[PDB]
Structures are given as C-alpha cells and as structure tokens.
Amino acid sequence: MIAPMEKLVLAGPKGRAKELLQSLQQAGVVHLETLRPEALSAYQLSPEERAELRRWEAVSAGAEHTLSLLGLEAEPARPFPEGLEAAEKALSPIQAHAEGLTRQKQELEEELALAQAYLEPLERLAALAHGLDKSPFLRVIPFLLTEKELPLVEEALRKALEDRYLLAHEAYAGGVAALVVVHRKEVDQAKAALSRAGVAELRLPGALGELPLSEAARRLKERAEAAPRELSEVRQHLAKLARESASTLQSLWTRAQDEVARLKALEELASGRFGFALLGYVPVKAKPKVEEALARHKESVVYAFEPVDEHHEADRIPVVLDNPPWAKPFELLVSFLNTPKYGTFDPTPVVPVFFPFWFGMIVGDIGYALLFYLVGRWLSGYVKRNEPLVIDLFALKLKPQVIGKLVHILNWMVFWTVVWGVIYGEFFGTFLEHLGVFGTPEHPGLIPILIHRIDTAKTANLLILLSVAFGVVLVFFGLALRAYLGLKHRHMAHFWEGVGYLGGLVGVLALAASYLGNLQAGWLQGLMYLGFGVFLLAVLMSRIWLMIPEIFTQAGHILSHIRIYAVGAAGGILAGLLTDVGFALAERLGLLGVLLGLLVAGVLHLLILLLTTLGHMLQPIRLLWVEFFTKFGFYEENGRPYRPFKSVR
Amino acid sequence: GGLGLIKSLAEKEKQLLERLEAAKKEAEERVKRAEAEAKALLEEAEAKAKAL
C-alpha cells in the first residue's frame, strides 16, 4: 500500500527560513516543490550566499578530486560543525601535499620510463663517441635501427665519402646503433638521403634529446640510479597521507555535500520582503518526526498539514512502496522497472505470494536446494562480516543491505524448492538409484512419490493443466485488478477494457475446452454466450478500438505459462540423465573407477548448474513482468520518484 | 489551506509595502521639518546680529 503522502506548507522569516530548512534537512523525510506562479517572486537567493555557494562547491570538488587523486573512493561519514576557514585550513595543506607529490612522481615515472628504455644505446654511443663529445666539425647522426640491413641505410654514406665519413653500428643488437659522422652539411644531406631510405635522429624530450650525449648519458645514469628510491619513498608518504588524512577529508566531503545540497534546495522557496513560504510532500508515517522537528522554531511557525488533493491533477505526487516486512525485500526486484502514479495499485505482495512458489516448480532437486543453502549461509556470513561485495570482473560493488535482502529472497525461495524437490521426488537429480528412497512401483524401496516427472504418460497432461491453471488465476486476477483501478478513478475506458478482455478470454477458454476438449457440449455453451456477448457489449459501449487483435495475444499471455513445466522437465531430466550416465557407467563398469565417474558427473552437473540456472531462474520473473504487471497497466507516465532531503551521513 | 496561506502572505507583503512607503514619507517629513527649523534659526540669528 502506497503511503497517502500529505502536503506540508510552511512560512515565516528568512533567517528562520535558513534555520528551519537546516532543521528540516537534518531530519530528511520531506520532498520539495517549486510553488512559483501565485503572488510571490521566484526567490533569487542572495549575492553573498551565491558566492558562499560557489565557494562551497569548489570545496567539495577539490576535496573529492584530492580523494580520487589519493586513490581511495568517496564514502560518507559523520560530519563536523566547524568554521569555514577552519575547513579551508583542513583542506588546503593535504591538497597541496598530494598535488605536489602527484606532479612529482608522475613526471618522475615519465622521466624514468623514457630513461630505462634508452639507457644502454645512449651509453653505447657515448662510449663510441668519446673522441668527439660536441666537437665543432662533424655532427653525429644517431639511429637506433633494426636488424642486419645496414647497407640499405649506408647507401647514403656510400653516396657520401666512401673512404671516409665513419658510419657503422658496433654492438647492442637489440637496436643497431647506426652512427654517421662526416661533417656538418655532408652529414645533413646524407641524413636526408638516409631518411629517404628510412632513418631518424635521436631527438627526444627531457635531457637526452636536448643536450650533448656524454653529459646526457651521465644524467640518465643519475636518474637510473636515483629514481626507484623516490618511487618507494613517495609510495610510503602517500600511504601515510592516506592513513592519516582520508578520515578528515571525507568527513569534510560529507559536510560539503550537505552544505551544497541545502543551499541548492534553498532556491526552491517563494518570498518577497517580510517572509517566505514553501511547500513539500510528507508520507503519513513521518508526521510526528517532522512535527517535533518543526516544534523547535520561533513561535512554532505555522504548518499546514493538508490532506493531499485527489487522483485528479495528480501526477506530480511522489510515490513510495510501504510494504509489510515479510514482503519488504522485493522492492528492488519490482523497482528495476518504473514506479506507479499514487493511485495505481501497489504491485509488490504478489511476487512473494507467487515467484518462489513458481521457482520451486522450476527447480525440483534437493541437491540444488542444499547448494543454494550453502551459498546462502556463505552470503549471510558475508553480511555478518559487513563487507561490501566487490568483483571487478563484473564491476559489481554493492552495499550489504541489498545483500541481506538477497539472503531473505534466497531463503524464502529455497524453502519452496525443497518442498518441490520432495513432491517431484528428485535428490540431486537422481540419487534414488542405489537407495530406493522414492517409491515408484517399478522399484518400490521406500516412501512414495507424488508425480514422477521423468515419464510423460503419467505426468504431462496433469502438469500442463496445472501450469495453464496458474496462468488462468494470474491473468484473471490481473484483469479484475485493472477493472478495480478503472472503477476507482471514475475513468471508464479502463473498466470497459478490463471487463471486455475478461469476457472475451473466458469465452475463448470455454469454447476451447468444449469444442476441442471433451464431450458434454451442453453446459459451457451458455458461458460462450455470456463471454462473447460481454465482449461485443464492451466493444460497442467502448469505441476504444484495436482491442480485437489484442485478445489473441491476451490468450497468448494466459497460455504462455507452459514454460514452468517446460524448463522443469528440461532441467529435471537433464540432471537425471547426467547423473544416470555418470552413476551407471561408473558403477556397472569397473566398480572402482566409480569415483572417476562420480566426480566427472559432479563437475558436469555443476557446469550445467552454472550455465543454465541463470536462465531458468530468470523465466518466472519475466513471466510475472510481461504478463501480470502489464495487464493492469503499470507502464503509464512513469510516476515520480520520492527522494527526500538527503543529509548523506 | 495552501491557497489561504499564499493569500495571507500576499496580504502581509502588501500591508508592509504600505508600511515601507509610509516610513519613507515620514523620514523625509522629519527632514523638511528639520531644515525649515534650521533656516528659521539662521534667520533669527542674523536678525539679532543686525539689530545688535
């Protein structure tokens, strides 16, 4: 049941406006509203508060940027009431430290990466050119080149002085150090011809490709012998900066987010010169908290607890769910989709009354239930450890309250798969073979079975009729509920569409069961009379056309509930056949390679577990999502999501 | 009573706009009285000086 969501109107003076918006934002259970057009101004806030707002946003952005620079992630904490320039003196030195160190070490890694890849060719050409460092007669064209194609680049030197003009590659065969030395203009033109044959001079950034090679090689030796020490020390100092700055910086981040949220919501008011007024929405189970919070102020400044205006002109109303706590943890599973419109039916209790009971009819293996109970006790130990669940393969990081809801749905699901593993009679596929624990008359060993599910002459017609019968109950409940919601708002087309689909569907079902099912064509024909008469009456008193092609898809939606028995038989006899092959070919072939067949059947059984339990877990909830939720509407105008004053904490 | 609250705030806001214009008339009325008394005092002072 959606909460009735009353209206809250307040007024007063403006210093008290900021103070009561503080006291309303600390107890954050209220939604806001613009309230522009009548008798008040749009409330351009203040110039000095605008400067304070943009400075607070700069504080928040700088703190979060410092934190992401530090490498950790931004979680809230409890804030601290302290002065703004005190927050500046808290923010700026650690920001200066981390910013100077992330300049220093990142440019150090740049210089170290450009150094270590080119130490040895540079030192090699320095030992080769120790008779001419920067002598003013002949430039030294360096080219760290490929393998033994030295004549292809030395053809330019052959075009140059052949009995002179020393150009070769001595050693260091990772890259052949083709050095060329003749003159200034001779080496320039021969370097142009060698670049036409493919060549390039060592002109890099930093100090190597901007200075003479001897002293630059000495500087590269200096950086190679110095830089890992600074690597280790700057990692140590950033670790210390993390461990003794992250708490206070994310605390002031929480404070800054609170201040920015309050000031940006402060413009949602309406005032002139001797007072303001604002409007908001409060759910009805939040009235004593807001009442005692607003009892603090000046002369208990005047509240208007309006009962909200009704379903006409009601699209701007926020929506919540408010379900009893036995059905509570499916709110995320019903809120993957959109939200209702405050006057649409609360859809959430039917998924606890149906979905685990359908998943039991999907999965009828006691071994699957025991493995689910094992992962459930693991996952409840994980919420005992209070760790957020993280996996970077899926980039799935999520908080332990969702994980506790997952514990609840997993337990409330695994009970029904236990009881439908009992009734269907399958232990881990089929381990009734050795110990005949389940009683069929072909090998009666122990307690009987209710339905065998491996053969179809005994099972298929009964199970397929019950699988259609659940869809009959579901779809008739959905169409009756749409007729109810059309009866509520005094909107008549929804009522006619609901009663028309109901009459047409029961008429088609009666005609099917009569003229294609059994004998006794006498009693049901009056029901066919009634059903098609109601359908024609609806189309005549409706004029809401193109329902006539929908009734075929509507029978499709009442009939598409075969898939629960379909994947039930599929997964059931698949598991039974796998354990049958493994158990038989292990036991009756060898009698001591039985552990070989047992563990390979176990690992293939867990393989098909891991490879199709996602699919036949997804099937009942898509059955709900595309039959039942779309019968009674639920896909119109998206509602409006209730977000209160946060106070992020 | 949201419409009543907006109506009451509009009535307030109007009544003290009237208070504000009454205040800015009254202050200038005090200014006119003060300058009239000052010019009368200067005239009496120079008349006493010329008679003496």
Contacts with A272 from chain B: Cβ below 8 Å:
13
- Among chain A, residues having any CB pair with chain B shorter than 8 Å are 7, 9, 11, 38-40, 272-275, 277, 279, 302, 304, 306
CA distance A463 to chain B (A): 59
Look at B10 and A40 and tell me if their CB atoms are within 8 Å: yes
Grouping H, G, I as helix, E, B as strand and the rest as coil, residue A280 is strand
CA distance B2 to chain A (A): 7
Radius of gyration of chain A (CA): 39
Tokens 């898509």, located at residue: A622
> DSSP letter at A278?
E
Look at B2 and A9 and tell me if their CB atoms are within 8 Å: yes
CA distance A190 to A472: 90
What distances in angstroms separate CA A297 from CA A16, A24, A32, A279, one per listed residue?
Answer: 8, 11, 20, 17
Cβ(A359)–Cβ(A620) under 8 Å? yes
Determine the Cα angle at A422 with ends A419 and A425, to 5°: 145
Please tell me which of the candidates B2, B12, B13 has its beta carbon nearest to residue A279. B2
CA distance B18 to chain A (A): 12
Determine the Cα angle at A199 with ends A197 and A202, to 5°: 170
* A423 CB-near residues (< 8 Å, 6+ apart): A364, A450, A451
Structure tokens that stand for A360 in this block:
């039991």
Contacts with B2 from chain A: Cβ below 8 Å:
7, 9, 279, 304, 306
Of A440, A444, A476, A474, nearest in space to A459 by CA: A440
CA distance A565 to A562: 6
* Minimum CA–CA partner of A302 in chain B: B5
CA distance A9 to A587: 79
* Minimum CA–CA partner of A273 in chain B: B13
Which residue of B3, B8, B9 is the best one to mutate when testing the A interface, meaning the one whose CB has the most A CBs within 10 A?
A: B9
Look at B10 and A11 and tell me if their CB atoms are within 8 Å: no
CA distance A340 to A344: 6
Size of interface A-B (CB pairs under 8 A): 38
Look at B10 and A279 and tell me if their CB atoms are within 8 Å: no
Per-position DSSP letters for A389-412, written without gaps between them: EEETTTTEEE-HHHHHHHHHHHHH
Cβ(A319)–Cβ(A342) under 8 Å? yes
Per-position DSSP letters for A97-164, written without gaps between them: HHHHHHHHHHHHHHHHHHHHTTSHHHHHHHHHSTT-SS-TT--EEEEEE-SS-HHHHHHHHHHS-TTS
Look at A39 and B12 and tell me if their CB atoms are within 8 Å: no
Contacts with B5 from chain A: Cβ below 8 Å:
9, 11, 277, 302, 304
Structure tokens that stand for A409 in this block:
């749905």
The resolution, in angstroms to one decimal, equals 3.2
Look at A39 and B1 and tell me if their CB atoms are within 8 Å: no
The count of other CB atoms within 10 Å of the CB of residue A334 is 23
Which residues does residue A178 pair with via DSSP β-bridges, in sequence order? A143
CA distance B8 to chain A (A): 10
Cβ(A254)–Cβ(A79) under 8 Å? yes
Look at B2 and A306 and tell me if their CB atoms are within 8 Å: yes
Q: How was this structure determined?
A: cryo-EM
- Among chain B, residues having any CB pair with chain A shorter than 8 Å are 1-2, 5-10, 12-13, 16-17, 20
* Minimum CA–CA partner of A39 in chain B: B10
Please tell me which of the candidates B6, B17, B20 has its beta carbon nearest to residue A277. B6
CA distance A387 to A400: 7
Kindly report the three-state secondary structure assignment for every residue of chain B. CHHHHHHHHHHHHHHHHHHHHHHHHHHHHHHHHHHHHHHHHHHHHHHHHHHC
